[PDB]
């Protein structure tokens, strides 16, 4: 009935979204699963949130997987009450992350086909850029 949201922390490296759903769906159906990831690189933040169709199922999973010695880490499973569970907390759940290679895009942005007008829009007033430093002197 009530959708129970479960926080899992201290996830061993490799216990990611596919592994969590495949494992936690055993206890019962899993509605939305999102494991936090860094903006720049998309690497795991080692904690996640899961939605279970019934709060009682989330209670059972919390009582069985909390302090689980897994790959040298104790797995922290605790149910978040709905009053601090936020509606946006599942934003981007079940959707694979896109590792944008900002270094690669910036590389192409550095070395891409360019025309005379864009070169003029690049040089601008570099003399003023030098002049600003000269005023700082």
């Amino acid at each position: 009935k009530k959708k129970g949201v479960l926080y899992v922390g201290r996830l061993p490296h490799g216990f990611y979204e596919k592994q969590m759903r495949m494992y936690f769906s055993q206890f019962g159906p899993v509605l939305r699963l999102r494991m936090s990831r860094n903006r720049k690189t998309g690497s795991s933040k080692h904690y996640a949130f899961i939605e279970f169709e019934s709060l009682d199922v989330a209670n059972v999973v919390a009582e069985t997987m909390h302090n689980y010695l897994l790959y040298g880490k104790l797995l922290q499973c605790k149910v978040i009450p709905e009053d601090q569970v936020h509606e946006n907390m599942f934003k981007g759940a079940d959707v694979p992350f896109k590792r944008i290679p900002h270094a690669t895009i910036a590389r192409l942005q550095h070395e891409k086909p360019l025309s005379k007008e864009k070169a003029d829009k690049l040089i601008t007033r570099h003399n003023r850029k030098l002049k600003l430093k000269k005023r700082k002197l």
Binding site: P12, H13, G14, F15, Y16, K18, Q19, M22, Y23, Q26, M65, Y68, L70, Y71, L75
Partner: protein, 199 residues
């Protein structure tokens, strides 16, 4: 039921394979291509769940889509590149005359009408490969060993072998994850010993 450690263990193995594949393919486009032999014997030793799709496809191209499958392949650059890609799962070496004869005489099955049919009589071989001057098992053996003109046709006709490890000893029957001690990679002449245990 499955426990969380297996899911993590699978992931670490998958990323282990991903790192190996990138290293082997990128900046390591070199293969040693075992020489002084035009024939190779390859057997599928291991397999992993959620196998990388590139490995999954290369295995079926080599016709090693199931564990304990054994295939005769021609020693060339193309096979060696694919064999390097799927190295951790396959054991390969140089089969001698005794192994090739024994494998064909004892564990050779032909794809007749598209089913696995035992090569018990030369009548089927003559009917299936008569147009290539292949009439007997010995014709199959000669073609395979010498890599003749119709080596491509003979290999396609031949069904992959099933060299499942044999557990005769009481210790072999009891120990866990027994696979005869089958290592992975290139063994050279040792595959004849592995063949001798199976045939």
């Amino acid at each position: 039921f499955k426990r969380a450690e297996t899911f993590i263990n699978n992931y670490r193995q998958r990323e282990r394979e991903r790192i190996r594949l990138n290293r082997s393919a990128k900046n390591k486009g070199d293969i040693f291509v075992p020489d002084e032999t035009k024939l190779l014997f390859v057997i599928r030793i291991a397999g992993v769940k959620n196998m990388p799709p590139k490995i999954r496809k290369v295995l079926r191209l080599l016709r090693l889509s199931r564990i304990n499958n054994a295939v005769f392949v021609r020693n060339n650059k193309a096979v060696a590149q694919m064999l390097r890609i799927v190295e951790p799962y396959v054991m390969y070496g140089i089969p001698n005359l005794h192994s090739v004869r024994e494998l064909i005489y004892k564990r050779g099955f032909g794809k007749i009408n598209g089913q696995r049919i035992a090569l018990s009589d030369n009548a089927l071989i003559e009917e299936a490969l008569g147009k290539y001057d292949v009439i007997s098992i010995e014709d199959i053996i000669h073609e395979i060993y010498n890599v003749g003109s119709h080596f491509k046709e003979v290999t396609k006709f031949l069904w992959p072998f099933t060299l499942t490890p044999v557990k005769h000893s009481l210790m072999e029957k009891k120990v866990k994850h027994f696979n005869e001690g089958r290592k992975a990679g290139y063994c050279g002449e040792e595959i004849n010993e592995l063949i001798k245990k199976q045939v």
